[PDB]
Amino acid sequence: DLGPEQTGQVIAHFGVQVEVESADGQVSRCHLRANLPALVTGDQVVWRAGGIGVIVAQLPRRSELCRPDMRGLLKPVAANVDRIVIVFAPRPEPHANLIDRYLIAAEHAGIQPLLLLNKADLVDESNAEGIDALLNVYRTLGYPLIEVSAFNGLAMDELRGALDGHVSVFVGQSGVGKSSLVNALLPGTARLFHFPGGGDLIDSPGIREFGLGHVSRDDVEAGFIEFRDLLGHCRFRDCKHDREPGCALLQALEDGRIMPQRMASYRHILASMP
């Protein structure tokens, strides 16, 4: 016995079994057919019913969020995420370095980012010279940025709007309010939840620690939008972009098409990779 084929999305992964939600808005547990590739939360599948179903086939993923293995290798932990929400705050102090890192991860994963200044209620006149400075570094790169407070409620209906129609992941250093933010947007391994205003979320303590490990220099360079356009124009195809004339990047910095705050963390980060 097996009912007809159906289209659905993966909600939870209970090892041998998988929680699956359909377009109808109904949930069912489905066993995993043997031949089937590895599945993660967010994946789109074909299944048949029987209250237990059988997952028959996996539909292509649009995107993948990976995470380091027990060994140290990257294995996917979520699928079909189209937005990564990078959350920082006035406290603890935000550094360009870690932000520039999460921005690279988002590029490596092939997923569009969205920066979030949480704890905007803590933006004193004292902080603003230092804060508006850093915000407008990513504002002038074309990146989406919102200033919010999961304490106040400041600009939360814009975030709910920014999250509408997307599948989103919440990522940032600990203590910026990731838990507080989820709870504010959802009052009551990777699991998938739906925002009441619209859009979905995939969450787990492991995905929250999602960031950047060791990669290639050419990966890192691709993580800088200013860079992507120029790379391959430095005359020296062997250019290291350091004291080298004919370095397109260098000329760009001079002209102001690269910001020194960025050209710095590029050096700091690349020199952290082996």
Ligand X SMILES: Nc1nc2c(ncn2[C@@H]2O[C@H](COP(=O)(O)OP(=O)(O)O)[C@@H](O)[C@H]2O)c(=O)[nH]1
Which x/- pattern over 178-197 shows residues binding ligand X (rule: CB under 6 A)? xxx-----------------
DSSP secondary structure string, the chain? ----EEEEEEEEEETTEEEEEETTS-EEEEEEPTTPPP--BT-EEEEE---EEEEEEEPPPS-EEEEE-SSS-EEEEEE---EEEEEE-SSSPP-HHHHHHHHHHHHHTT-EEEEEE--GGG--HHHHHHHHHHHHHHHTTT--EEE--TTT-TTHHHHHHHHTTSEEEEE-STTSSHHHHHHHH-----EEEE-SSS-EEEE-HHHHT-------HHHHHHT-HHHHHHSS-SS-TT--SSS-TT-HHHHHHHHTSS-HHHHHHHHHHHTT--
Which x/- pattern over 231-260 shows residues binding Zn ion (rule: CB under 5 A)? ---x----x-x-----x-x-----------
Shortest separation between residue 209's beta carbon and ligand X, angstroms: 10
Is 30 annotated as ligand-binding? no
Shortest separation between residue 247's beta carbon and Zn ion, angstroms: 3
Q: Is 108 in the site for Zn ion (CB under 5 A)?
A: no
Among ligand X, Zn ion, none, what binds residue 177 when CB lies within 5 to 8 Å by partner kind?
A: ligand X
Is 178 annotated as ligand-binding? yes
Shortest separation between residue 252's beta carbon and Zn ion, angstroms: 9
Residue numbers at the binding site for ligand X (CB under 6 A): 118-119, 121-122, 149-151, 174-180
**Where do contacts with Zn ion occur on this chain (CB under 5 A)?**
234, 239, 241, 247, 249
